[PDB]
Amino acid sequence: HGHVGADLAALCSEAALQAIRKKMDLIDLEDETIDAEVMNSLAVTMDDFRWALSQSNP
Amino acid sequence: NRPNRLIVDEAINEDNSVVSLSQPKMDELQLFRGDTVLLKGKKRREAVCIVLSDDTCSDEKIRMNRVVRNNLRVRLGDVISIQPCPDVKYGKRIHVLPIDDTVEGITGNLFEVYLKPYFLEAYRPIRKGDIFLVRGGMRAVEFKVVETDPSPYCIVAPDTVIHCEGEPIKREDEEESLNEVGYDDIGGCRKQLAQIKEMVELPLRHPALFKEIGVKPPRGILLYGPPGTGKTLIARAVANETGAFFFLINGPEIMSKLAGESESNLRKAFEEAEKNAPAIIFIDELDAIAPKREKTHGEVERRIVSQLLTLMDGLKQRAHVIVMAATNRPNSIDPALRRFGRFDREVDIGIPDATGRLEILQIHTKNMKLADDVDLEQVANETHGHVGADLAALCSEAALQAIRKKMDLIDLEDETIDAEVMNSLAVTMDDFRWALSQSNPSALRETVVEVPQVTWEDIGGLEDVKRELQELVQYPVEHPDKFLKFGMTPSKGVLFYGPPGCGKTLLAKAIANECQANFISIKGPELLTMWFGESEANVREIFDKARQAAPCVLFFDQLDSIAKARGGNIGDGGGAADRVINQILTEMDGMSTKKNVFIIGATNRPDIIDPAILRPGRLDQLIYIPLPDEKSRVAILKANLRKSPVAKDVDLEFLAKMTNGFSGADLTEICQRACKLAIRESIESEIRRERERQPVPEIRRDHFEEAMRFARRSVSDNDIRKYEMFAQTLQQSRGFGSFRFPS
Amino acid sequence: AFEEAEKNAPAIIFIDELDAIAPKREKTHGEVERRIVSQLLTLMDGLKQRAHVIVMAA
Ligand SMILES: Nc1ncnc2c1ncn2[C@@H]1O[C@H](COP(=O)(O)OP(=O)(O)OP(=O)(O)O)[C@@H](O)[C@H]1O
Ligand SMILES: Nc1ncnc2c1ncn2[C@@H]1O[C@H](COP(=O)(O)OP(=O)(O)O)[C@@H](O)[C@H]1O
Ligand SMILES: [Mg+2]
């Protein structure tokens, strides 16, 4: 409602980072390179955007 | 959670240059005996060794000696990953430098004594930065390989030339690596360390994930908290763990009187950081350097803020440098810094809890030698509000007290101390207790108060009141899981009202010690101020300190002073008295989550207190502290005389019968009078003992009888009716009586 | 001075009128004085406590 363009950019970044967080708990975190299948499965969804909205304040 | 990951294990006979792994694990790793492999360790330290097969070694463990662990800067029980080193070839040459301290006193040539037999017909792989020990000469010498040819993986063949010429390497590098600050040296900040790790380490290691999802990692991190919580510690640990240069900026350093000097300093700092990329820019006291432009009148401050905004905007140019800041009060910072592309992510570092301060104590005491008596759990428990820096200084003071004792033993004139005295040197529990006594908590360095050491047995009677007070503080903190099962939040308010001297103030002093929770005491009118908005501002500061020091007990002694019924006075001291009550109302129950802040109020006259103060949610329980009855009067006299030696002939039970309406303080005066009479008799007796030259071990019956002649009833019968009317209004307000559900 | 102190370890350092050279960094007129205080702190933190050199300030 009161979000300036910087706030919306922060929201999009937070949603993408939340998707990356979802992919965090699966990986070993010590792998030299990440698997191609989980590389392809990574995409921003509505759940990530709603989490960002819940964590979004102007 | 990979086959490469293995648990650290010791070595029975395996030496430095090789490694030994269990044969099934070697087969799982597709590794043959005699193969060269790579070891990965913490702090970005690596070594190259020959893998071996051993039946003694377990499948989940890797056999390495102490020196191999010292190479990787890792301890026993750590998790490390092993990978077969690729394309390892015989070394053309190897440049080895022994430690400078070890070479001293070695008459024979270092190379011939150590290196020539060690590498003869052995083919031992080495990487740059590897240290290996060879027994020989007068003293065992550690050799550090600064240069490897070919770098970094090479095999030392007999034909490969080995030389120890040049200035021997210093132990400073080794001790700096040992003392380098990592994530493990932070205590109580694991929840915040997770977000910091996600912000910093993840983008560096897997930028492919970010490029695939098409997002860029944040560049601004704002750590805010009380001093000593380790924000600078966390920043330096992050800088060291990621192999980035740590650059420190202090707010006073940037500040300068000359025009354009502070911004030039900031630009120079950013330029040096970008040159030393990757690097971490850390700005201590960001609040002092960058306040609100509209709020500040001085031109230089908004000048610095604008320069900082420009520097942050220009920072995001793939410079691989991340700017971090530590401040006490984030709200004092210019809001333009809080936006995205700037200090967008703010991480709250708070007062460590019991387990957090236990972790801090374990971290700082890991090098100190601890006896069996000392237990760090109780040390954490008694440190109610200490911060990490306070805990470190506390451990240092306990150690220094141990040196104080061993000094009192020793003469110090001798140049060399006997080995027996050194063997006697140790650290015990009493040293830590003394450090606890001397050290003060930074959270409450303002509200520190003396402790009369009032304990429950000091209070006589009020057993029902004592039990309720403990459950108020003990239940929510010691058993929070119980409250989540039923789902209703705990009650956090009690008002004590009654005649003066019945024990309201003792219960607050006693509750401070026993429940091991932070205790803030407000003298009744202490908060009020002559300025227009300062009386209410002091109220918000008290409730903010209590929220930061949660679990905290906020004791409002003589609550009737600041909590009056609104509208009683038109002037109300200029209307400020009502505004103080309205401020108190909002903090106790307002538009915020409730922390473990337990408000306790003691008042003589409760009927004047604002009715909004006394509703459930603010001071949930109204407890009446009456005049002690006959049974309680015995307890008060027994508790008061518990310290003093009193004759067994004294019958305390009869005193309670006679003193029908005496208060707790009145009975205390009677014992005080009896003590002075017994002291006065001793003083005159010993004077007669001196006069004849030129008795009273305990208080007898006679002193009490003379004391009772001066006994008075402090609380009048008129006042007692005033207190008993109030308790009757509560009973009549409820209605009915002996409530029971039908059948 | 600190280099000579570590070179001749063990050594003893005494500073006379330290407050004259090291006022409060929050309120300091000259930048040179602030840099002197910064060098004091940097040299204090630089010693790894193996120098066994005690700095005395009056
Ligand atoms: N139940 C009690 N047991 C032991 N000592 C008591 C008791 N009640 C009162 N006293 C003694 O009375 C003195 C004052 O008591 P205290 O300060 O707790 O009273 P209070 O009811 O809070 O009074 P006030 O209304 O003046 O604030 C102390 O010496 C204390 O030891
Ligand atoms: N969470 C913590 N864990 C371990 N030690 C700590 C912690 N916080 C502070 N310390 C100790 O306090 C000392 C100084 O910390 P400091 O930089 O003053 O913290 P802050 O960033 O709050 O100013 C450090 O040497 C460290 O040993
Ligand atoms: Mg009192």
From Swiss-Prot, chain C:
UniProt subcellular location: Cytoplasm, Cytosol; Endoplasmic reticulum; Nucleus; Cytoplasm, Stress granule
Residues carrying N6,N6,N6-trimethyllysine: 27
Outcome of substituting residue 27 to L/Q/R: Abolishes methylation by VCPKMT
Signal peptide residues on this chain, from the entry's feature table: none
Phenotype for residue 26 to A: Does not affect methylation by VCPKMT
Posttranslational mods: Phosphorylated by tyrosine kinases in response to T-cell antigen receptor activation. Phosphorylated in mitotic cells.
Effect of residue 30 to A: Does not affect methylation by VCPKMT
Reported effect, residue 29 to A: Does not affect methylation by VCPKMT
Similarity comment: family membership: Belongs to the AAA ATPase family.
Entry domain remark: The PIM (PUB-interaction motif) motif mediates interaction with the PUB domain of RNF31.
Assembly: Homohexamer. Forms a ring-shaped particle of 12.5 nm diameter, that displays 6-fold radial symmetry. Part of a ternary complex containing STX5A, NSFL1C and VCP. NSFL1C forms a homotrimer that binds to one end of a VCP homohexamer. The complex binds to membranes enriched in phosphatidylethanolamine-containing lipids and promotes Golgi membrane fusion. Binds to a heterodimer of NPLOC4 and UFD1, binding to this heterodimer inhibits Golgi-membrane fusion. Interaction with VCIP135 leads to dissociation of the complex via ATP hydrolysis by VCP.
Disease: Inclusion body myopathy with early-onset Paget disease with or without frontotemporal dementia 1: An autosomal dominant disease characterized by disabling muscle weakness clinically resembling to limb girdle muscular dystrophy, osteolytic bone lesions consistent with Paget disease, and premature frontotemporal dementia. Clinical features show incomplete penetrance. Frontotemporal dementia and/or amyotrophic lateral sclerosis 6: A neurodegenerative disorder characterized by frontotemporal dementia and/or amyotrophic lateral sclerosis in affected individuals. There is high intrafamilial variation. Frontotemporal dementia (FTD) is characterized by frontal and temporal lobe atrophy associated with neuronal loss, gliosis, and dementia. Patients exhibit progressive changes in social, behavioral, and/or language function.
Biological role: Necessary for the fragmentation of Golgi stacks during mitosis and for their reassembly after mitosis. Involved in the formation of the transitional endoplasmic reticulum (tER). The transfer of membranes from the endoplasmic reticulum to the Golgi apparatus occurs via 50-70 nm transition vesicles which derive from part-rough, part-smooth transitional elements of the endoplasmic reticulum (tER). Vesicle budding from the tER is an ATP-dependent process.
Protein name: Transitional endoplasmic reticulum ATPase
Organism: Homo sapiens
Lineage, uppermost ranks: Eukaryota, Metazoa, Chordata, Craniata, Vertebrata
Gene this protein is translated from: VCP
Residues of the full protein shown: 289 to 346 of 806
